[PDB]
Design an enzyme around this catalytic site. Structure first.
Site, short mmCIF file in Angstrom:
data_model
loop_
_atom_site.label_atom_id
_atom_site.label_comp_id
_atom_site.label_asym_id
_atom_site.label_seq_id
_atom_site.Cartn_x
_atom_site.Cartn_y
_atom_site.Cartn_z
N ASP A 15 -7.63 0.64 -2.72
CA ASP A 15 -7.98 2.00 -3.19
C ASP A 15 -7.10 2.45 -4.36
OD1 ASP A 15 -9.40 4.38 -3.24
OD2 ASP A 15 -8.04 5.39 -1.84
N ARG A 71 -1.03 8.03 -4.21
CA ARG A 71 -1.94 7.08 -3.61
C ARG A 71 -3.32 7.70 -3.35
NH1 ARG A 71 0.26 4.69 1.87
NH2 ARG A 71 -1.40 6.01 2.73
N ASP A 72 -4.35 6.85 -3.41
CA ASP A 72 -5.73 7.26 -3.10
C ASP A 72 -6.16 8.46 -3.95
OD1 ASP A 72 -5.68 5.38 -0.70
OD2 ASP A 72 -4.14 6.85 -0.12
N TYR A 126 0.84 -1.21 0.00
CA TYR A 126 0.00 0.00 0.00
C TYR A 126 0.87 1.26 0.00
CZ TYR A 126 -3.90 3.13 1.45
OH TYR A 126 -4.86 4.12 1.52
N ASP A 128 -9.07 5.44 10.62
CA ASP A 128 -9.04 5.68 9.18
C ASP A 128 -8.62 7.10 8.82
OD1 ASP A 128 -10.13 3.08 8.76
OD2 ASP A 128 -12.15 3.91 9.02
N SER A 134 -4.42 12.24 1.11
CA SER A 134 -3.72 10.96 1.15
C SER A 134 -2.50 11.05 2.05
CB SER A 134 -3.29 10.48 -0.23
OG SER A 134 -2.56 9.27 -0.10
C1 LIG Z 1 -15.65 5.28 -4.55
O1 LIG Z 1 -14.76 6.17 -3.92
C2 LIG Z 1 -13.83 5.58 -3.12
O2 LIG Z 1 -14.51 4.85 -2.02
C3 LIG Z 1 -13.51 4.14 -1.20
C4 LIG Z 1 -14.25 3.34 -0.18
O3 LIG Z 1 -14.89 2.30 -0.85
C5 LIG Z 1 -12.55 5.12 -0.54
O4 LIG Z 1 -11.56 4.34 0.12
C6 LIG Z 1 -11.07 4.63 1.36
O5 LIG Z 1 -9.93 5.46 0.96
C7 LIG Z 1 -9.19 6.03 2.15
C8 LIG Z 1 -8.04 6.73 1.64
O6 LIG Z 1 -8.49 7.79 0.84
C9 LIG Z 1 -8.75 4.84 3.02
S1 LIG Z 1 -8.12 5.63 4.58
C10 LIG Z 1 -6.45 5.00 4.69
O7 LIG Z 1 -6.54 3.74 5.48
C11 LIG Z 1 -5.24 3.09 5.53
C12 LIG Z 1 -5.51 1.80 6.26
O8 LIG Z 1 -5.51 2.09 7.64
C13 LIG Z 1 -4.28 4.05 6.24
O9 LIG Z 1 -2.96 3.52 6.34
C14 LIG Z 1 -2.36 2.53 7.15
O10 LIG Z 1 -3.14 1.56 7.91
C15 LIG Z 1 -2.13 0.82 8.67
C16 LIG Z 1 -2.99 -0.13 9.41
O11 LIG Z 1 -4.01 0.65 9.99
C17 LIG Z 1 -1.32 1.71 9.64
O12 LIG Z 1 -0.22 0.96 10.16
C18 LIG Z 1 -0.74 2.92 8.98
O13 LIG Z 1 -0.32 3.90 9.98
C19 LIG Z 1 -1.78 3.54 8.14
O14 LIG Z 1 -1.25 4.67 7.41
C20 LIG Z 1 -4.20 5.36 5.49
O15 LIG Z 1 -3.33 6.28 6.20
C21 LIG Z 1 -5.54 5.98 5.36
O16 LIG Z 1 -5.45 7.15 4.53
C22 LIG Z 1 -9.85 3.88 3.34
O17 LIG Z 1 -9.32 2.65 3.96
C23 LIG Z 1 -10.62 3.48 2.16
O18 LIG Z 1 -11.86 2.80 2.62
C24 LIG Z 1 -11.92 6.01 -1.59
O19 LIG Z 1 -11.19 7.10 -0.98
C25 LIG Z 1 -12.94 6.62 -2.48
O20 LIG Z 1 -12.27 7.38 -3.50
#
Ligand SMILES: CO[C@@H]1O[C@H](CO)[C@@H](O[C@@H]2O[C@H](CO)[C@@H](S[C@@H]3O[C@H](CO)[C@@H](O[C@@H]4O[C@H](CO)[C@@H](O)[C@H](O)[C@H]4O)[C@H](O)[C@H]3O)[C@H](O)[C@H]2O)[C@H](O)[C@H]1O
Length: 358
Positions: free
Chosen positions: A135, A88-89, A83, A313, A95
């Site tokens: 994502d 990203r994202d 990831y 999140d 992001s």
């Molecule tokens: C249709 O539009 C899209 O919908 C989807 C949902 O179906 C959206 O997705 C979501 O996007 C978010 C990012 O924009 C992420 S938040 C993201 O989560 C990860 C997971 O936690 C984080 O990172 C790491 O996680 C590790 C374990 O927890 C940690 O060790 C570490 O510290 C974390 O950084 C990250 O930082 C967050 O930004 C959602 O998970 C996701 O559902 C999408 O945005 C829409 O465009």
């Protein structure tokens, strides 16, 4: 299918999540709920390699798993999330990804994969299962009108290809992220999704290690719902089993007998969202079905816990440079700390609302 990556293996338990959970259970005042909470450390989760800073931890987990297997007479399996795409994202408001396309993102990502491959290479007695880039590719199905996504498309494809091609060289079992029923499971999105995932599989050489797809990662959908969540109106594929039942035959027709894994770590409580797209710290979530290969579907290798419930999140602090306003919505638990940091109130509710009970 014939070869389920989990059969015959013990899953290595994340020491990091274990540390978080033990510390969390100490802070839960009710003794009975506290012991329920502590037992969560025995439930296997995925370790997120969300930055190059996490790669040395992967090394220690592989080496620890190797020694544990020798100590106990078992074969060990380590679960990881790849990831770290540049930009990203791409469809999100914020992001936390460290790499940018504008600053050598592709080359930086390749080096990230190279370091991961160099770690995995050293522990051939440990099996690795990887979720490939949550994502990411799902944005290239539905969100190409997002300019950040349009400009990222070639980089996402090239970087995911590099990950698939080179992790296959060290035998990693791989499931590409494929969103969830409310993202790619809309009937109209199924064929575009199938066409994209097949083209990616073909570009990476159709390696047998590319097992299939991961769904509901970090989301909240039911695998099999008692009745459709009201957020799903208009979509006959209202849970993950409907989505997978509809998508899997499309992949099979392209020559890819793909199998699936489904995140259920925060799926214990249904009907908690106002809109299906709301994804940040959804209030009232409970831990869902524990990971198991007893999935009820020919297409599903395992129920899994990919997102570690209790890690935020995203922050609800609008002054944060990483603030995504999705995390301030009425159905988002607030106040919430920065992404990845522990969210104790949220964890306590995940334990209290677990379904099945812990
Ligand atoms: C249709 O539009 C899209 O919908 C989807 C949902 O179906 C959206 O997705 C979501 O996007 C978010 C990012 O924009 C992420 S938040 C993201 O989560 C990860 C997971 O936690 C984080 O990172 C790491 O996680 C590790 C374990 O927890 C940690 O060790 C570490 O510290 C974390 O950084 C990250 O930082 C967050 O930004 C959602 O998970 C996701 O559902 C999408 O945005 C829409 O465009």
């Amino acid at each position: 299918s014939a070869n389920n990556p989990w059969t015959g293996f013990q899953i290595f338990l994340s020491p990091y999540y274990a540390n978080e959970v033990a510390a969390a259970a100490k802070q839960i005042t009710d003794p009975t709920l506290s012991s329920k909470a502590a037992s969560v450390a025995n439930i296997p989760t995925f370790t997120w390699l969300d930055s190059v800073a996490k790669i040395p931890d992967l090394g220690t987990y592989l080496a620890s798993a190797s020694a544990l297997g020798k100590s106990t007479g078992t074969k060990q399996l380590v679960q990881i999330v790849i990831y770290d795409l540049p930009d990203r994202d791409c469809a999100a408001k914020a992001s936390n990804g460290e790499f940018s396309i504008a600053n050598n993102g592709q080359a930086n990502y390749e080096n990230y994969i190279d370091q991961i491959v160099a770690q995995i290479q050293q522990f051939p007695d440990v099996r690795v299962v990887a979720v490939i880039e949550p994502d990411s590719l799902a944005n290239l199905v539905t969100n190409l009108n997002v300019q950040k996504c349009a400009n990222a498309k070639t980089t996402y494809l090239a970087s995911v290809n590099y990950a698939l091609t080179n992790l296959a060289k060290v035998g990693v079992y791989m499931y590409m992220d494929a969103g969830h029923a409310g993202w790619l499971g809309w009937p109209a999105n199924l064929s575009p999704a199938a066409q994209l995932f097949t083209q990616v599989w073909q570009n990476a050489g159709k390696s047998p290690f590319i097992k299939g797809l991961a769904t509901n990662v970090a989301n909240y959908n039911a695998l099999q719902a008692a009745s459709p969540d009201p957020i799903t109106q208009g979509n006959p594929n209202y849970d993950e089993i409907h989505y997978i039942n509809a998508l899997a035959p499309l992949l099979q027709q392209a020559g890819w007998d793909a199998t699936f894994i489904v995140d259920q770590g925060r799926s214990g409580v249904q009907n908690i969202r106002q809109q299906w797209g709301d994804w940040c710290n959804i209030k009232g979530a409970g831990f869902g079905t524990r990971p198991t290969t007893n999935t009820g579907s020919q297409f599903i290798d395992s129920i899994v816990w990919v997102k570690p419930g209790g890690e935020s999140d995203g922050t609800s602090n609008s002054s944060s440079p990483r603030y995504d306003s999705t995390c301030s919505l009425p159905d988002a638990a607030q106040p919430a700390p920065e992404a990845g940091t522990w969210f104790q109130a949220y964890f306590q509710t995940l334990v209290s609302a677990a379904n099945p009970p812990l």
